[PDB]
Amino acid sequence: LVHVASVEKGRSYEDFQKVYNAIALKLREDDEYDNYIGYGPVLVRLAWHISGTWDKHDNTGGSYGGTYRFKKEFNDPSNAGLQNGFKFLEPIHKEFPWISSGDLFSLGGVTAVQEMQGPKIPWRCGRVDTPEDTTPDNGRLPDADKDAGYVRTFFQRLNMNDREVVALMGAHALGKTHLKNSGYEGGGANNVFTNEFYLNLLNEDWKLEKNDANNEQWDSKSGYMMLPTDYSLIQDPKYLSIVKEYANDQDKFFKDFSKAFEKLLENGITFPKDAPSPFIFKTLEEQGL
Ligand code: HEM
């Protein structure tokens, strides 16, 4: 099973920078969503969930086919709340109907991270929409009620090692949980990409509490929360070392996150040797827009 990247006919960097700019301007303008967090975090989550279905064993799932547009995947209980991100992107797809679905969903994540003052994430085009029968079954995305061993084992399916896992989890500096989506009660939230997830894990006095959906989560008197899978990163000695590293080196975190997130978004895709190089998009701020 091979998925070969194929550049949307005649398109080049300038075309994709236009799409980036459209997403970025809408992020700036539709700022009220989710109590003024805006759409950045949900777009990051969307890009991760469309990629996180991948299975290295058989090359099924992943971002290539844009299969989230089909009912089976759209309605996965693990994807509750992502409809908001899909709705955000729909008008942009109408404006740029030539872009593939997987390219749009992945580019939305890239755009969001950069516009939230995160690292630059190189991005490659050429995902191709695949038919409804290529849609992975539900249940490939991870549960939040588990321990470090679960996290480690889960991420082996995505060909991610312990450093890649800890870097990726730093995206939990962004946004929040919502009881109605996931059964976890949200805490303090931000929409600026920093290494604060790691600082909070190490510095707060966490208490194991039960929420109104009868799930356990870790809460602090400061008003922050951690999922069990978040907290696992300080219970496991290998993960803890890496958490400390990123707490103490913002730049290292940014660089490691950039590499792991690009990898996540490209898993399963074969890029021909004459494919274009990855694009690095300018932010609105860099363009004076
Ligand atoms: C073991 C792995 C993971 C688990 C169990 C997990 C679990 C969750 C849960 C339960 C939520 C709350 C959903 C809601 O209630 O709206 C969430 C939100 C989020 N996750 Fe994860 N996550 C994991 C890994 C990741 C990774 C790898 C990324 C990206 C690189 C990511 C990015 C996010 C973002 C940005 C949000 C916030 C969305 C919002 O504010 O609407 N997560 N995650």
Q: What separation in Å is there between the alpha carbon of 11 and the centre of ligand 1?
A: 32
Q: What separation in Å is there between the alpha carbon of 84 and the centre of ligand 1?
A: 14
Has domain 142-260 been given CATH number 1.10.420.10? yes
Beta strand spans in 223-285 (E): 225-226, 269-270
**CA-CA-CA-CA torsion for 70, 74, 76, 77, nearest 10 degrees?**
-160
Decide if 277 contacts 11 (C-beta within 8 A): no
Helix (H) or strand (E) holding 260: helix 250-266
Spatial distance between the Cα atoms of 59 and 30, rounded to a whole number of angstroms: 36
Whether the CB of 44 sits within 6 Å of ligand 1 = yes
Distances (CA, A) of 140 to 18, 79, 81, 97, 153: 33, 11, 17, 29, 13
Helix (H) or strand (E) holding 256: helix 250-266
Atom of ligand 1 nearest to the CA of 84: 41
- Please tell me the residue having the least CA distance from ligand 1 atom 23: 169
**How many other β-carbons are positioned within 10 Å of the β-carbon of residue 131?**
9
Torsion angles phi and psi, residue 217, rounded to 5: -150, 165
Can you read off the two tokens belonging to residue 243?
């958490």
Q: What separation in Å is there between the alpha carbon of 148 and the centre of ligand 1?
A: 16
End-to-end CA distance of the chain: 43
Can you read off the two tokens belonging to residue 71?
């009912």
Describe the crossing of helices 83-95 and 13-29 by its angle, rounded to 10 degrees: 130
Spatial distance between the Cα atoms of 230 and 156, rounded to a whole number of angstroms: 17
Task: Return the best residue to mutate from 37, 177, 212, 230 for the ligand 1 pocket (most ligand atoms within 8 A of CB).
Answer: 177
**How many other β-carbons are positioned within 10 Å of the β-carbon of residue 247?**
18
**Can you tell me which residue has the tokens 């480690």?**
152
Numbered ranges of CATH 1.10.420.10 in the chain: 142-260
DSSP string for 55-74: BTTTTBSSSTT-GGGSHHHH
Q: Which amino acid is at 275?
A: A
Spatial distance between the Cα atoms of 236 and 129, rounded to a whole number of angstroms: 39
Whether the CB of 110 sits within 6 Å of ligand 1 = no
- Please tell me the residue having the least CA distance from ligand 1 atom 8: 144
Catalytic residues: 49
123 forms beta bridges with: 279
In the sheet where 216-219 sits, what is the strand order?
A: 207-210, 216-219, 225-226
Helix (H) or strand (E) holding 29: helix 13-29
Can you read off the two tokens belonging to residue 50?
């469309």
Instruction: Find how far residue 171's CA is from the centre of its chain.
Output: 7
Numbered ranges of CATH 1.10.520.10 in the chain: 1-141+261-289
| CB neighbour list of residue 130: distance below 8 Å, 6 or more residues apart | 3, 64, 65, 66, 67
Distances (CA, A) of 203 to 171, 244, 265: 18, 11, 31
Resolution of this deposited model, Å: 1.6
Residue list for the binding site for heme b: 172
DSSP string for 150-215: HHHHHHHTTT--HHHHHHHHGGGGSS---HHHHS--------S--SHHHHHHHHS--EEEE-TTS-
Query: What's the fold here for domain 1-141+261-289?
Result: Peroxidase; domain 1 (1.10.520)
Indicate which technique resolved this structure: X-ray
Torsion over CA: 264, 135, 111, 181 (sign): negative
